[PDB]
């Protein structure tokens, strides 16, 4: 089969600027060539065909050129949309195949989380478990300490984070921090206080309650 | 490398 | 206009066999081939097969023994069948269509079928409010969310007040916890003069355990 090498893995570019997206391919495929973004939680949306043929409904930004082994998509003018990931795919020889994908990152300005904090529900305590909650909420760019604290006892390796894919409107993530206890050990404690470290702030934000 | 719960390279 | 769209996600056992249907519309499948691929952490994108207009079958040569693709033409149709998986068969499953009868630019994409290969069984989530606050509020906005724990497999789909409020919305990726369930929250932030007036609602679908709960989130 063809092996459809694209670099680099990563892009990240500021908006307005042109970008170019690399196809190689590990024989001559002539123009054979399709390009494809999927966005988060998408299925691939189809963008150019053979090598620089346009396609209904795709913005003008777009387009591709190449012949032979090098293959290259451009956006002559990026969006904060355009954050996806990109492949290529050839045709000239059966089986079709795709390239691994090169990831598009948008910079921006620095922008701070605000940081908000939400103790267990009475429901969750009723089940014996207590889930608290730390929300970091868009910010510039994706690097943050999330410190966890009870009773001033410093927390390890008991809380889990999750940070959403680059947002599409605002260039901005937000992470969560879900620190985890059991009923039992909740009750027996008083300050909850979750500290947050990030480029944008001039020192760590506290955000903490106090258990009833 | 591709991530199912987002959809995403990762 | 032209859709495909897939059965839902679901659990298979190792070893055992995958079924998805793909139904269309915008179109007849005795015009068009409709087209089967995956994307998976270990392979990305990977295409398994076809069936063509006249109901002649390729298979990607990995899957000749173990694929089949067949379907209802007056039913518009297409049944994607695969046997003895193994836990890399992990992946989004798609049907596809190209633009033209006979061609491979796939111009038609369906949703998407999360397929999880995995011994363990479906559970579905319990939903935690995350209830507004002081602690949550600056500036007269506030913050609020569902927690959505302990459920398995992925996916899990989350929207707010049936669809209605979408703006401000952050649904995170799961994670997997050390008992081998997920865990997410999905959060927005709202004008908090709006709290004594409008209805918070997070409405969690999990499709794999057949579990859809409507939780009401309110301030404390």
């Known amino acids: 089969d063809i092996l459809l090498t694209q670099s680099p893995v990563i892009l990240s570019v500021s908006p307005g600027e042109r970008v170019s997206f690399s196809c190689r391919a590990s024989?001559?495929?002539?123009?054979?060539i399709h390009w494809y973004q999927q966005r988060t939680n998408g299925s691939p949306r189809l963008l150019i065909k053979?090598?620089?043929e346009s396609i209904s409904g795709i913005p003008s930004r777009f387009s591709g050129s190449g012949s032979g082994t090098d293959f290259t998509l451009s956006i002559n003018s990026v969006e904060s949309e355009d954050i996806a990931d990109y492949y290529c795919?050839?045709?000239?020889?059966?089986?079709?195949?795709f390239g691994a994908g090169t990831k598009l990152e948008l910079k921006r300005t620095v922008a701070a989380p605000s940081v908000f904090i939400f103790p267990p529900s009475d429901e969750q305590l009723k089940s014996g478990t207590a889930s608290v909650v730390c929300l970091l909420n868009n910010f510039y760019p994706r690097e943050a300490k999330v410190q966890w604290k009870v009773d001033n006892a410093l927390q390890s390796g008991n809380s889990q984070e999750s940070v959403t894919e680059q947002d599409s409107k605002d260039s901005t993530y937000s992470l969560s921090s879900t620190l985890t206890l059991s009923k039992a050990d909740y009750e027996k404690h008083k300050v909850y206080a979750c500290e947050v470290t990030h480029q944008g702030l001039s020192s760590p934000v506290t955000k903490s309650f106090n258990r009833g | 490398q591709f991530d199912l719960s987002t959809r995403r390279l990762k | 206009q032209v859709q495909l769209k897939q059965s839902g996600p679901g659990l298979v056992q190792p070893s055992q066999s995958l079924s998805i249907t793909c139904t269309v519309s915008?179109?007849?499948?005795?015009?068009?081939?409709v087209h089967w691929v995956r994307q998976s952490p270990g392979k990305g994108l990977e295409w398994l097969g076809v069936?063509?207009?006249?109901?002649?079958?390729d298979y990607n040569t990995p899957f000749t023994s173990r694929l089949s693709i067949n379907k209802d033409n007056s039913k518009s149709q297409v049944f994607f069948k695969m046997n003895s998986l193994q836990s890399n068969d992990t992946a989004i499953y798609y049907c596809?269509?190209?633009?033209?009868?006979?061609?491979?630019?796939?111009?038609?994409w369906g949703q998407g079928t999360l397929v999880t290969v995995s011994a363990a069984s479906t559970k579905g989530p319990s939903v935690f409010p995350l209830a507004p606050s002081s602690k949550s509020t600056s500036g007269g906005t506030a913050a609020l969310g569902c927690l959505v724990k302990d459920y398995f497999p992925e996916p899990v789909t989350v929207s707010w007040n049936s669809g209605a409020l979408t703006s401000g919305v952050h649904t995170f990726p799961a994670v997997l916890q050390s008992s081998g369930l997920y865990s997410l929250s999905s959060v927005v932030t709202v004008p908090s003069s709006s709290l004594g007036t409008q209805t918070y609602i997070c409405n969690v679908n999990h499709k794999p355990s057949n579990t859809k709960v409507d939780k009401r989130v309110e301030p404390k």
């Open positions: 596809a269509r190209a633009l033209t009868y006979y061609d491979y630019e796939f111009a038609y």
């Open positions: 915008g179109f007849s499948l005795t015009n068009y081939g």
């Open positions: 069936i063509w207009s006249g109901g002649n079958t």
């Open positions: 024989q001559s495929i002539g123009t054979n």
């Open positions: 053979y090598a620089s």
């Open positions: 795919q050839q045709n000239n020889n059966w089986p079709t195949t």
